[PDB]
C-alpha cells in the first residue's frame, strides 16, 4: 500500500516549538510523516466501527495501535525507544475518514 | 490526590495463575499509563510491563509470555496476570502509574506507587 | 537488556556526611535516569528526574548529575531521615531496567 507523505527531512516545521501535523486518516489508506531528527512514521486507520464509536490507529516506525472514541478523542501513544506522540483526533462519525492533530515534539531518534 | 489501592491473595499455589488488582481512587484511569512492578531480596527491582485503556500494552520480554496487564474502565481497576507461576515469581508487588510528557512527574517515572502486596508462591 | 550497575551495594555512614552513590550504564543513556529512595516496608520514592531536575518536596541536600554513561547522585549533608536504598532507573531503552541498589546504612 502507497502511503500519503506529509513533512520533509530537512524541516522541523510542524513538530517543534509547540506546533503540530495535521492528518486525514482514510479507511484502507496510509499516511507517512518526516521531519528533521524525528523517525519516520506510517500512521492507518485499520477499523472503524458503525458509529463511528470507535477508530484503531496503527502507528509503525520506519506497530502500536491507538483507540479514538467519541468520548476519549485526545491520547498520548508511547512507541517504545522512539518517545511518544499525541493524537489528538476530531472524530466526526463514519465519514470514511479521520482527523487528527499529532504532536510529535517528545518523538526522538533510536539511533 | 489520585491514589492506589492494591488487591490479592498473598499466597498462590505452583503452576497456577497470579492475579493482582490495583483500583485508582479520587481520579480518572483513561489519562495515564499504568506499570507494575516486582521486588524480591536476590533479583532487585524488576519492571513487569505497562498498560494504557486506548494504547496496546507493553511487557518485559523475559515475562512477556507469561503476562498480561489489563485497566478495566467500568470497574476503575488495573488487573496483573501471571500464568505458569514457580517459586522465582515470590516478590513483593507494586502497582504503579508510568509518567508520560504531560502526566505525571515526568516521561517513563513512577511517582505514584501503591502499598505493595507480598506474594508468595507455595504448595 | 540494557545493564545498570550502582557502587557500592552497601555504605555505611555517618549523619552530616557527604554521600556519592554512583549508577553506571552499558551503552550511552543521554540525561535518561531518575532517582529513587526506599525506605523499609515503603514503595520507592522518586527524588531526581532527567539525571539532574529535582522532584517537588524533596529536600535542596539531594542532587543528581552525569549523561551518557556514568551519574551520580550526592546528598550534601546526611540527615537521620536519610537512611534509606537508593535506587537509579534508566528510560532511554526498553525494557525499563533498575540498578541493584545502594543500602545507607548509619556507622558504628
Known amino acids: 500500500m502507497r502511503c500519503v507523505g506529509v513533512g520533509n527531512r530537512d524541516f522541523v516545521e510542524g513538530v517543534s516549538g509547540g506546533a503540530w501535523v495535521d492528518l486525514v486518516l482514510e479507511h484502507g489508506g496510509c499516511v507517512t510523516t518526516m521531519a528533521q531528527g524525528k523517525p519516520t512514521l506510517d500512521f492507518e486507520l485499520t477499523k472503524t466501527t458503525a458509529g463511528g464509536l470507535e477508530y484503531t490507529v496503527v502507528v509503525t516506525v520506519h506497530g502500536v495501535t491507538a483507540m479514538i472514541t467519541p468520548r476519549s478523542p485526545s491520547v498520548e501513544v508511547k512507541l517504545p525507544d522512539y518517545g511518544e506522540l499525541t493524537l489528538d483526533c476530531e472524530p466526526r462519525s463514519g465519514t470514511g475518514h479521520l482527523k487528527c492533530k499529532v504532536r510529535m515534539e517528545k518523538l526522538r531518534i533510536k539511533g | 490526590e489520585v491514589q492506589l489501592l492494591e488487591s490479592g491473595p498473598g499466597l498462590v499455589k505452583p503452576s497456577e495463575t497470579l492475579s493482582l488488582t490495583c483500583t485508582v481512587s479520587?481520579?480518572?484511569?483513561?489519562?495515564?499509563?499504568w506499570s507494575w512492578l516486582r521486588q524480591s531480596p536476590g533479583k532487585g527491582l524488576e519492571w513487569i510491563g505497562y498498560?494504557?485503556?486506548?494504547?496496546?500494552?507493553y511487557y518485559n520480554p523475559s515475562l512477556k509470555s507469561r503476562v498480561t496487564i489489563s485497566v478495566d474502565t467500568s470497574k476503575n481497576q488495573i488487573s496483573l496476570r501471571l500464568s505458569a507461576v514457580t517459586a522465582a515469581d515470590t516478590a513483593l508487588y507494586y502497582c504503579?502509574?508510568?509518567?508520560?510528557?504531560?502526566?505525571?512527574?515526568?516521561?517513563?517515572?513512577?511517582?505514584?506507587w501503591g502499598q505493595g502486596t507480598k506474594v508468595i508462591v507455595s504448595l | 537488556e540494557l545493564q545498570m550497575t550502582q557502587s557500592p551495594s552497601s555504605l555505611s555512614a555517618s549523619v552530616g556526611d557527604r554521600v556519592t552513590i554512583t549508577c553506571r550504564a552499558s551503552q550511552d543513556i543521554s540525561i535518561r535516569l531518575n532517582w529513587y529512595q526506599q525506605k523499609p516496608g515503603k514503595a520507592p520514592k522518586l527524588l531526581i528526574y532527567?539525571?539532574?531536575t529535582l522532584e517537588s518536596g524533596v529536600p535542596s541536600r539531594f542532587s543528581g548529575s552525569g549523561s551518557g554513561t556514568d551519574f551520580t547522585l550526592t546528598i550534601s549533608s546526611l540527615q537521620p531521615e536519610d537512611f534509606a536504598t537508593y535506587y537509579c532507573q534508566q528510560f532511554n531503552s526498553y525494557p525499563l531496567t533498575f540498578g541493584g541498589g545502594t543500602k545507607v546504612e548509619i556507622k558504628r
Open positions: 498498560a494504557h485503556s486506548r494504547v496496546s500494552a
Open positions: 532527567d539525571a539532574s
Open positions: 479520587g481520579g480518572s484511569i483513561s489519562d495515564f499509563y
Open positions: 504503579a502509574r508510568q509518567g508520560t510528557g504531560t502526566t505525571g512527574v515526568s516521561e517513563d517515572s513512577f511517582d505514584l
